[PDB]
C-alpha cells in the first residue's frame, strides 16, 4: 500500500468524477451563467415552487413537506453515490463489512454537507441537476421547523467556499472525511487510521502543490472537518424532532437506517 500512495490522489479524484453526477466545476459555470443564455428556473416563493412541481416526478401535501420529501430524494442519490465512491478508496472494501457501514453511517452527511457547498452561493442553491435554483430567503421564509434545516448549511458553505477548493481537493477531503478512525463501533481501528494517515498525507501534499500560497489551508481543512461533525450532529437532532412531531414527514428507508441511532 505504501506503493499506491503515488497515484492515490489521482485515483481518488477520478472516482469522484466517475461517481458524482454534479460537481463544483459544473455548478460554478451554471451559477455564473456564462455557458448559457438560459439560467435555471428560480424558485423564490410559493408560486414559483408550485410552478416547478408541475414537472412532477418527471403524496402531495403541504409545501414544506413537499420540499422535505424532494430533498430526501437527492440525499438518497448522494448516499448511494458515496457508497460506490468509498468502495473505490484503496483498502475500503478490504475492511470488515460492519466497519464499511459505520464509516458510511457517520460520514455520509459530513461529506454531503461538504459537497453541497459546490451548488451554493449566498443567495441560494442549484437543485434538480442545475435546472433549478431555490433561494436562501425562500427556504428561510418556510415555517416553524423546516426553515431551520438548510440555513446552517448555507452558513458553512459560504466559509468553505472561500477556501476555493477544486474537485481534486474536495475528492481527497471527502475521502478523508470517510476514513475516520474515531467513529463509534469500529472493529479494527488501526487499519482504518492507517488508511486515514495515507489519505491525509497525499491531501497535504496536494494542497501544497495546488494552493502554494495558502500555507495553512490544510489545518483550515482539519477545522472544517470538526465543524462538519458538529453540523451533522445538530442536523441529526433536528431531523429527529421532525420525525417525532411531523406526521406527513416520511423518511426514505435508506436514510431511516442512517439516522437511526446516530447522534
Amino acid at each position: 500500500e505504501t506503493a499506491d500512495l503515488k497515484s492515490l490522489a489521482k485515483r481518488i479524484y477520478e472516482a469522484y468524477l466517475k461517481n458524482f453526477n454534479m460537481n463544483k466545476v459544473k455548478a460554478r459555470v451554471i451559477l455564473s451563467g456564462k455557458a448559457s443564455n438560459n439560467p435555471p428556473f428560480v424558485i423564490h416563493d410559493m408560486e414559483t415552487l408550485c410552478m416547478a412541481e408541475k414537472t412532477l416526478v418527471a403524496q402531495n401535501k403541504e409545501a414544506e413537506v413537499r420540499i422535505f420529501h424532494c430533498c430526501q430524494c437527492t440525499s438518497v442519490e448522494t448516499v448511494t453515490e458515496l457508497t460506490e465512491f468509498a468502495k473505490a478508496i484503496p483498502g475500503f472494501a478490504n475492511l470488515d463489512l460492519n466497519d464499511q457501514v459505520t464509516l458510511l453511517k457517520y460520514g455520509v452527511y459530513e461529506a454531503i454537507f461538504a459537497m453541497l457547498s459546490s451548488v451554493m452561493n449566498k443567495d441560494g442553491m442549484l437543485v434538480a441537476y442545475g435546472n433549478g435554483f431555490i433561494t436562501r430567503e425562500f427556504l428561510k421564509s418556510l415555517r416553524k421547523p423546516f426553515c431551520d434545516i438548510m440555513e446552517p448549511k448555507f452558513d458553512f458553505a459560504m466559509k468553505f467556499n472561500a477556501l476555493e477548493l477544486d474537485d481534486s481537493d474536495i475528492s481527497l477531503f471527502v475521502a478523508a472525511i470517510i476514513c475516520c478512525g474515531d467513529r463509534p463501533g469500529l472493529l479494527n481501528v488501526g487499519h482504518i487510521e492507517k488508511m486515514q494517515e495515507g489519505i491525509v498525507h497525499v491531501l497535504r501534499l496536494h494542497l501544497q502543490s495546488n494552493h502554494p500560497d495558502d500555507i495553512f489551508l490544510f489545518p483550515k481543512l482539519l477545522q472544517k472537518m470538526a465543524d462538519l461533525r458538529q453540523l451533522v450532529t445538530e442536523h441529526a437532532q433536528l431531523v429527529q424532532i421532525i420525525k417525532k412531531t411531523e406526521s406527513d414527514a416520511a423518511l426514505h428507508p435508506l436514510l431511516q437506517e442512517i439516522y437511526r441511532d446516530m447522534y
Binding site: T80, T83, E84, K87, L97, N98, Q100, V101, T102, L104, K105, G185, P253, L254, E257, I258, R260, D261
Partner: peptide, 15 residues
Amino acid sequence: SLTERHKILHRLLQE
C-alpha cells in the same frame, strides 16, 4: 448487530 440494523446500506456495500 449492524449488518442487520443497516440492511439496504449493507446490500449496497456488496457489489
